């Protein structure tokens, strides 16, 4: 559905001993709207431009619409995010089911 084009750092070749990727320049290609736009990346990492671009991690969420650059030390294991999303959806569904009872608004969620 979407194709991401990540520009290399300083247009270096893959065989270069110091290779990197530039996440600030990513072009998405939509298939439903026949459009090719840019990615509104949100760089949240201490260091600025002086920080070497070898410790980074682009996290993509919300159906390929949210981009965040974070260091590779604070990453999340797959089970963690799976459990997070499952817990959020399950809590939303549980609050929906219970909202239709007369004893609501006087209850507590333990």
Q: Which residues bind another protein (CB under 8 A)?
A: 100-102, 104
| Closest to another protein by CB, 14 or 106 | 106
Smallest gap from residue 110 Cβ to another protein (A)? 22
Query: Tokens 């499952």 identify what position?
Result: 86
Smallest gap from residue 97 Cβ to another protein (A)? 13
Angle, alpha carbons 39-45-46 (nearest 5°): 145
Smallest gap from residue 101 Cβ to another protein (A)? 6
CA 79 – CA 77 distance, rounded (Å): 6
| Closest to another protein by CB, 13 or 99 | 99
Among candidate residues 10, 68, 19, the one with its CA nearest the CA of residue 39: 68
């Amino acid at each position: 559905s979407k194709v991401f084009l990540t520009k290399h750092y300083r247009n270096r070749r893959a065989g270069d001993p110091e290779f990197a990727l530039d996440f600030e320049e990513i072009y998405v290609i939509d298939s439903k709207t026949k459009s090719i736009t840019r990615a509104k990346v949100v760089v949240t990492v201490p260091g600025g431009r002086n920080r070497d671009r070898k410790n980074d991690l682009l996290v993509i969420r919300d159906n390929g619409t949210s981009f965040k650059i974070i260091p590779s030390e604070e990453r999340d294991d797959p089970t963690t995010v799976i459990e997070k999303e499952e817990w959020k959806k399950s809590r939303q569904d549980m609050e929906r089911h219970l909202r239709k009872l007369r004893d609501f608004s006087v209850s507590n969620w333990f």
